[PDB]
């Protein structure tokens, strides 16, 4: 029969909504919920470890039928997340692994980290200094991303990771990352010594790219996922630095945990993971992947 949430309580629990990843996956799963006639528990820990914590155990002392977890570091909401299911809780997942999770909406990441790599390494000739953030490796799909691009140059070893990775932040995540991008420059002033910027989201992208271009310093590519359209529209502007971005579908990806809450509450089995595409824009692929999710 049709998918229902009628009658039902779900606990709805995000890391934050700082940026448009994690607010279009907050409001669609909020969106859904209520689509499907169920009553959200709508809790934002505003990039909070302590807030999300806590709201995760309000929620288990809620008992709602089900809790969906969107983002945040693995070790930091794991015991909860186990307390929720002990709880006799069903817990699904967005961009979280956990072992206490029935079903994880995520993009496939080893795909994302892979390509973005590959692109990287073609972009810059199989050869050049990348400077790279790295401040989420706690989190699932970060994580994935940046084990791939270690995994990808590792047969190109003409490509390096320039030392001291950086530590992207959140918040002030723009600020900080040209503030970092900017010093680096500086460390390294020769034409052609650094020849790339990664990171696992694109919003520290946004900041770097900036930075490059206040430094006069624009032959540095940036690569990044999201597809924030801040960012995509960087892409596509030919005199911008900015030359990847991996879009995903943050509103697809909060729906579907939503439609996958009400599938397991009908009795149905869900698979550990559910994968939603990404599209890789470049600068020729920026237009038909903006166009595929306006
Ligand atoms: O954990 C930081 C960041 O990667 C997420 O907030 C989000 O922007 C997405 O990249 C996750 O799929
Ligand atoms: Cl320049």
Excluded: M
């Excluded at 590959?118 to 989420?136: A, C, R, T, Y």
Aim: with cysteine; aromatic share 6%; hydrophobic share 40%.
């Amino acid at each position: 029969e049709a998918l229902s949430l009628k009658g039902k309580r779900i606990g709805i629990s995000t890391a934050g909504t700082d940026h448009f990843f994690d607010l279009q996956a907050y409001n669609a799963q909020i969106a859904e919920v209520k689509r499907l006639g169920g009553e959200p528990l709508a809790v934002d820990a505003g990039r909070s470890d302590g807030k999300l914590v806590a709201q995760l155990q309000t929620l288990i002392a809620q008992k709602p039928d089900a809790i969906v977890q969107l983002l945040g570091t693995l070790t930091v909401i794991d015991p909860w997340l186990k307390r929720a299911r002990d709880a006799g809780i069903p817990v699904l997942t967005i961009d979280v692994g956990s072992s206490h999770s029935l079903n994880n909406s995520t993009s496939d990441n080893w795909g994302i980290g892979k390509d973005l790599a590959l692109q990287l390494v073609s972009d810059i000739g199989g050869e050049g200094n990348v400077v790279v953030f790295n401040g989420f490796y706690g989190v699932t799909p970060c994580a994935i991303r940046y084990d791939q691009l270690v995994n990808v140059i590792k047969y190109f070893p003409k490509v390096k990771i320039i030392q001291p990775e950086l530590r992207d932040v959140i918040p002030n995540t723009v600020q900080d990352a040209f503030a970092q991008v900017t010093a680096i420059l500086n460390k390294y002033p020769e034409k052609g010594s650094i020849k790339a910027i990664w990171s696992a989201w694109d919003i520290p992208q946004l900041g770097a790219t900036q930075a490059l271009a206040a430094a006069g310093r624009t032959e540095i590519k940036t690569y990044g996922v999201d597809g924030s359209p801040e960012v995509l529209q960087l892409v596509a502007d030919p005199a911008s630095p900015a030359a990847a971005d991996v879009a995903q579908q943050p509103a697809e990806l909060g729906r579907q945990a939503i439609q996958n809450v009400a599938l397991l509450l009908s009795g149905k089995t869900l698979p550990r993971e559910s994968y939603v595409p990404a599209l890789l824009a470049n600068k020729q692929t920026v237009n038909e992947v903006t166009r595929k999710l306006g």
